[PDB]
C-alpha cells in the first residue's frame with residue numbers, strides 16, 4: 199500500500215551518460231552503441247544563441263573539436279552529423295553498458311523519468327509528464343542540457359526526451375532522440391511563450407482510481423455524468439477533453455475498483471466544482487495529473 | 503530552474519539487489535561484499551508472524567535453506583547469522599558491483615531514496631523522509647520487504663533503511679542495516695499504532711527557501727517573529743519544534759536569499775494561520791516537508 203511519484207530505476211541510463219565539450223560549452227551526451235547524442239547548441243557561444251545558423255557553425259567544427267569523456271576516459275570521435283536539433287558523434291568504441299533501447303516520440307500526457315546530469319555525471323532522478331503544451335516542468339540548472347527522459351519495459355530503455363531549453367517562464371523544452379522538438383520551440387534564445395498548461399484529465403482519473411485502491415475514498419459521490427456533460431466541466435477548468443480512448447484505457451482500473459469510469463468522472467466534476475474543502479487525496483491538496491493509467495496499474499501491481 | 507522531489511540515481515543500489523527465498527517466502531536482499539542482508543522474517547510462515555521466536559525458528563534452518571539468486575545465477579551460502587531483525591547470509595562470492603558504502607542510522611526528518619524491489623528486481627525509485635514518528639510513507643506491495651533506503655555522497659552509498667512492515671494504517675516500518683527498527687516497531691503481526699505524524703518544520707522552511715530561489719514569493723510577508731513565538735504556533739499545528747541547530751542549518755539558504763530565518767518563520771506562521779487561500783507553492787497546495795536544507799542546496803547548486 200501507499201502511492202508515490204516513482205521514477206524508473208536509472209542504472210541502465212547512468213551507464214550511457216557522457217560529457218561533451220565543444221570549445222568552452224560543456225553539456226551531457228547519451229552514449230548508445232558507437233554513437234553519442236547531444237544537443238546541437240553545444241557548438242554555440244551564448245552569443246551565437248540569439249540567431250544561430252547551425253549548418254554554418256558546424257562547417258567550422260571537426261571530429262577532434264568534440265571532446266567526449268565517459269567517466270575519466272576520452273572517446274575518439276571518428277564522425278559527426280546533425281539530425282534536426284541533435285548532434286550524433288560517431289566514436290570508435292561501442293558503449294559496453296549499452297542497454298536494449300528504442301527511441302520513441304511520446305504524446306502529451308505521457309509520463310517518463312528524467313536523469314538530471316551535470317558534466318556527464320547523474321545528480322538525480324524524478325518522474326515527469328509531457329504537458330499538453332509540449333513543455334515539461336523539470337528541475338534543470340546550466341550544464342543539464344543533454345539530460346534524457348526515458349521509460350523502461352523490463353530490460354528495454356525507450357528514450358523519449360533530451361533536454362535543450364529553459365523558457366523565460368522557467369518551464370523546459372527539448373527534443374525526441376531524433377532531435378525534433380516537442381511543441382513549437384526552437385533552439386534559439388528568443389521570445390518563446392508556452393500555450394495554456396491544461397490538466398491531463400485521464401491521468402487525474404487514473405490517480406483517483408489509485409486513491410480508492412489505497413483507501414482514500416471520501417471524494418466518491420452518489421452521482422454519475424455523461425462524457426459530453428463531463429467535457430463541458432473539463433473545458434471550464436482547463437482540463438483536456440476526455441475521449442472514449444481515455445475511457446477504454448481506464449477500463450482495468452474501473453474493473454478492479456468496480457467504479458464505472460463515468461461515476462469517477464462525476465466525482466472529479468464535484469471536486470472541480472467544490473474543491474477539496476481543505477482535505478487531501480494520497481497526501482496531495484491538488485488533483486495530481488502526472489500518473490498515467492499504465493503508471494497506476496504498474497505501481498499498484500508491482501511490475502519490475 | 504524548477505524544483506522536483508528528486509531521488510538519487512539508483513544504479514549503484516540496483517547492482518546490490520538479490521532475491522532471497524526461505525521455504526515458500528521470497529523477498530529482497532542486499533548483496534555487499536560477500537554478505538547478503540535481508541529481513542529475518544524471511545524464515546517465517548505468516549502463521550509464525552503472529553508471535554515468532556526467531557532464535558528458535560532459525561535453529562531449524564541451514565545455509566542450504568537460504569536460496570540467494572543474483573539475476574539468474576545462484577549464490578552459495580557458506581554461513582548465516584542473526585543481527586537484531588536482519589539476517590546476514592555469508593556467500594562464497596563478493597558482489598563485483600559492490601559500491602563504496604556505509605551503514606548509517608538516520609534521524610527523523612532526514613530524507614533518502616527507496617529502490618522499490620520485487621523478487622530481487624528493481625521496480626522504481628522515489629524520495630522519502632523518516633517521519634518524526636519513525637514511520638515512512640512508502641509505496642510497498644507484498645514481496646517488497648528487503649527494499650532499501652539510501653543516500654549517495656559522490657561515489658559512496660550510505661544505506662539507512664531496509665523495509666520490513668506495513669502497519670494496519672498503510673504506513674511503513676523498517677530497520678537500519680544493523681537490523682534495529684526505527685521507532686518502537688517489532689517484526690510481528692500485532693497491534694502497532696504510529697504516534698502523531700508531525701510536520702518537519704526545518705524541511706518546510708528549506709522548501710520555502712527553494713520556492714523563493716525558483717520565483718514563488720507571494721507568501722513572503724512584512725513580518726518577523728522569535729523562535730519561542732514561532733514554536734508556540736508550530737505546536738498548535740503539530741509542527742516539530744525549531745531548534746537553534748535548525749536555524750544554523752538554514753544559514754546558507756538565508757545567506758543566498760537574503761531572507762533571515764526568523765522572517766521566513768513569520769511567513770510560515772502566516773501560512774499556518776491563514777492557509778494558501780487556493781494558491782500554490784512550487785506546484786503544491788500544501789507545505790512540503792520531505793526536502794532537507796541539504797536537499798535544497800544540492801538540487802539548487804547541481805551536485806552530482
Ligand SMILES: Clc1cccc(CN2CCOCC2)c1
Nearest residue numbers: 300301302303357374375376
Ligand atoms: Cl524517436 C522517432 C520519432 C519519429 C520517427 C522515428 C523513426 N525514424 C526512423 C528513421 O528515420 C526516420 C524515422 C523515431
Ligand SMILES: Clc1cccc(CN2CCOCC2)c1
Nearest residue numbers: 604605606607661678679680
Ligand atoms: Cl547503521 C549503525 C547504527 C548504529 C551503530 C553502528 C556501528 N556499529 C558498528 C559495529 O558494531 C555496532 C555498531 C552502525
